[PDB]
Amino acid sequence: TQQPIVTGTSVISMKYDNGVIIAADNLGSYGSLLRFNGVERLIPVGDNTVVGISGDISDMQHIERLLKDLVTENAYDNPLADAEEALEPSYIFEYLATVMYQRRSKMNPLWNAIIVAGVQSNGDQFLRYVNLLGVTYSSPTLATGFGAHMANPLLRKVVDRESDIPKTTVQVAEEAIVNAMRVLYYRDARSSRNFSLAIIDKNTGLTFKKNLQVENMKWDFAKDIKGYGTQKI
């Protein structure tokens, strides 16, 4: 049993017709102190998987090393390490899910909420969630922390069920994700303007976008707001 110290906030994600999108801001908070502004919380594994992590950053870095070690280990005595016997998103997730549940069962959890986004060998979209309790679930849209409360409602308006996935393009999906990140910046006190976004497409592969910013923000209406009730000036 511990308490999280340096923390990362929402990870948001969704499926679209040819793959998955996942995003997370570049902030490592220290309570209310916005301590670290250059933290990458999307960690790619190979060219087919991106693991998005929220919660304790020290545990994230540990998980980051486990995944790095997993790739090394998979390549051992494996002539098809970059082909048929490459790591799948499903393999990577099940491994993490095992670790997370084992660690919670020893009463020493990895204080995280994780979303594994990727594309399988057969082109199938993979998107599944796992957290410090070892709880797992899949959905057309997945989000951690504040993202669950604010991003999911917006992302679910695009892909409300399984049948909406083939109807959703990468441009529409990315637009929805980027808008959700703006909404989270407006409303999450532990978020930053800077974020990373990753697209894993079955045709165009892994596209990893760094140093993105929330833009097209509405603040002008603030000038008209005065006082808290009766004040006119």
Partner 1 sequence: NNYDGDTVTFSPTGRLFQVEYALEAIKQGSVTVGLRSNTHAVLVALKRNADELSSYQKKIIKCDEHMGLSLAGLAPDARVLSNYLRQQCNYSSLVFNRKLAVERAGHLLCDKAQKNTQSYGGRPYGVGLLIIGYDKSGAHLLEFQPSGNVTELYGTAIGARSQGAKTYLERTLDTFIKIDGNPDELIKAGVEAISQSLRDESLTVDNLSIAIVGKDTPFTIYDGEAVAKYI
Partner 2 sequence: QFNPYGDNGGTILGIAGEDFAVLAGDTRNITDYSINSRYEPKVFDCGDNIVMSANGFAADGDALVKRFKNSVKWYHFDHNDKKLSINSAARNIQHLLYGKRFFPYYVHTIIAGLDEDGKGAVYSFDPVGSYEREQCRAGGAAASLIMPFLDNQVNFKNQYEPGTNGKVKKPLKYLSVEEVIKLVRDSFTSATERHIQVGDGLEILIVTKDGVRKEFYELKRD
What is the rounded CA–CA span in Å between residue 118 and residue 175? Answer: 19
Least separation in angstroms between CB 138 and partner 1: 13
Residues 6+ apart with CB under 8 A from 9: 25, 27, 29, 54, 145, 146, 147, 184, 188, 190, 191
* Interface with partner 1 in residues 116-135 (CB under 8 A): 121
Question: DSSP states of 195-231 as a string?
Answer: EEEEEEETTTEEEEEEEEE--S---GGGGG--SSSS-
Question: Residues binding partner 1: what is the number (CB under 8 A)?
Answer: 13
* Interface with partner 2 in residues 128-147 (CB under 8 A): 129, 133-139
Q: Does 137 bind partner 1 (CB under 8 A)?
A: no
Based on CB atoms, which residue is closest to partner 2, 161 or 232?
161
Coil/strand/helix, residue 120 = coil
What is the rounded CA–CA span in Å between residue 48 and residue 41? Answer: 17
Active site residue 1: yes
Q: Does 78 bind partner 1 (CB under 8 A)?
A: yes
Handedness of CA 218, 222, 228, 232 (dihedral sign): negative
Q: Does 85 bind partner 1 (CB under 8 A)?
A: yes
Among 81, 148, 172, 178, binds partner 2 (CB under 8 A): 148
Based on CB atoms, which residue is closest to partner 2, 72 or 98?
98
Helices vs. strands in the chain: H and E counts, helices first: 4, 13
Within 13 Å of residue 128, how many CA atoms lie on the same side as its CB? Answer: 21
Q: Does 95 bind partner 1 (CB under 8 A)?
A: yes
Among 47, 124, 162, 175, binds partner 2 (CB under 8 A): 162
Based on CB atoms, which residue is closest to partner 2, 39 or 96?
96
Residues 6+ apart with CB under 8 A from 200: 19, 20, 21, 22, 48, 49, 50, 117, 118, 119, 206, 207
Least separation in angstroms between CB 187 and partner 1: 36
Based on CB atoms, which residue is closest to partner 1, 116 or 197?
116
Binding residues (CB under 8 A) for partner 1: these are: 77-78, 80, 84-85, 88, 90-91, 93-95, 98, 121
Residues that bind partner 2 (CB under 8 A): 1-2, 101, 104-105, 107, 109, 129, 133-139, 148-149, 152, 161-162
Supply the residues annotated as catalytic: 1
